[PDB]
Amino acid sequence: KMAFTLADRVTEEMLADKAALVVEVVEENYHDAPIVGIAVVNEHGRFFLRPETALADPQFVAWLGDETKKKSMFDSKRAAVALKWKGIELCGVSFDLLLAAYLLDPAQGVDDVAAAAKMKQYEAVRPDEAVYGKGAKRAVPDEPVLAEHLVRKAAAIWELERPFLDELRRNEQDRLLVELEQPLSSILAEMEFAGVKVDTKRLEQMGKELAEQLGTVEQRIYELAGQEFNINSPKQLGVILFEKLQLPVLKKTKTGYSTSADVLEKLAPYHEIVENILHYRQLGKLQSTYIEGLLKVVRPATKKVHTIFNQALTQTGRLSSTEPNLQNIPIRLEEGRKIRQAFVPSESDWLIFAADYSQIELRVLAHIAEDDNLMEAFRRDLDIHTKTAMDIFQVSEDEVTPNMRRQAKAVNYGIVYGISDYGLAQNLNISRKEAAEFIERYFESFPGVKRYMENIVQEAKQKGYVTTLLHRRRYLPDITSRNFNVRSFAERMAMNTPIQGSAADIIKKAMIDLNARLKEERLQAHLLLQVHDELILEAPKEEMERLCRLVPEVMEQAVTLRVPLKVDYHYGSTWYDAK
DNA sequence: GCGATCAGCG
DNA sequence: ACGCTGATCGCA
Ligand SMILES: [Ca+2]
């Protein structure tokens, strides 16, 4: 029903200097995945290509790799990484409909061309789910059906770039697309394809010792409980604690007794079993997610894991990381932190280099709220978390344990993002009256923060949305809801999203500038991971001293705020030692 | 599939 | 009754 050429060879009119390009990878994880078909729409017509012909044709390969031949795409990172696994470089992507859609409205959850097209009343393309099926029924259709679907996606991309660019421009988001998100897409593609090497011998040895300690703690739990049970069974666990042992019920879930770690910590005066259960769960978490789960995704020939950074998922502009998640590798407990010893450089005589912003959201908040005292604090490079711990526990700076600092950290963010006196009383094990008075005293010292929280909620109600420093936008329709609980959740999004999102804009800008400086200095160093406010790189040993000067400077100069940005950095033989 | 839970990020 | 995530597991 749409005219296109089912091409047998590549011809010169398919290689125009501007085109819409579809390089179709059906598998959710695109690493090393098949490319099932290619479509090209340009001023000369519409074309479908079989991958085994086009990707072995040297004029098409060169066209893909020519930066001056501009391509409009949907999810260019997926295509660029799948092509890298084919030994082919994709350059010249000048418009990415996924990232355009995500900037205009992150809550659409746009995951295919049909969903983005609908935003502009374009419906001459089908949802990917309707063409391929779902679950065990998923299949590549017959070539005529495939070709027409890939041509329709390309034709849609071709039509939609202009209306998306126009709305982006009206939102002040077009430089955000073209100068930030789209260049970041190519950097993430390199990071994902390079991967992270893993010491599988060390992991597997940790797994065996973990399995030994797991059984022991099981038996101490069975003994303390009198009997056996499925320590992960909420009904059987709930029955042991709250019926057999008759511990108080501090919290219920929609399903029944809560056994979350906060409950169990409060029950520790009552019985020794709850601490063994916490230790059991923690050991089980390391074994399931970080030992077995990671060995499951290691590519065996290279011992590399290749995460996927979702760049158009979070409602704040943060990345997320999937399969494996390399943004939530343990660090706080020493047992879990040793897993970071299995993450190693990919070449001998290379090192891991990590750098991260300290207290970035509080600095962003100081700049945006223009709170005099909070700006002064950061102009002094004070450690707000340690200072707040000193205040809470009535101790001195040397007496601040790491755990009391983690506590103060959650108080600092909690208060600015709307924790109630109840919530803070629960977290510090203090009375509710002392929690309310503490909070009022915190805003006495930072009245500009309080003004800003009130102003940003009223601005959300008037505009319908909130924005970040680089004009990322999040719509908040529940901000005028009549239900109190719905409206309250939306108000705390208005308080938090401009700050967390601005901090995500800054690290993205820093990654782009870092890559350019690394190329300007001709270093072999390259990014491996982003963890929200940290960058992880690997480089030859011989470049570490350069990176110690270059990387903190690039990150600190990514933007100019009314307070300085501060960056800490470490390097070493494994990710564990890069702290 | 979904909720509870927990790992990370602020 | 601070916010943003992803993976695992049991399933009142
Ligand atoms: Ca940090």
Numbering used by the authors: 298 to 876
Q: What did the publication describing this PDB structure actually write?
A:
Polymerases generate nascent strands of genetic material by stepwise phosphoryl transfer of nucleotides to primer termini, yielding O3′→P5′ phosphodiester linkages. We reported that 3′-NH2 primer extension can be catalyzed by a modified DNA polymerase, yielding N3′→P5′ phosphoramidate DNA (NP-DNA). The large fragment of DNA polymerase I (BF), cloned from the thermophilic soil bacterium Geobacillus stearothermophilus (Bst), acquires nontrivial levels of N3′→P5′ polymerase activity via two surprisingly minor substitutions: (A) a single active site mutation (F710Y) and (B) substitution of its divalent Mg2+ cofactors with Ca2+ (1). To add evidence that a single divalent metal ion cofactor catalyzes unnatural NP synthesis in BF, a polymerase A family member, we carried out a single nucleotide primer extension reaction in intact crystals.
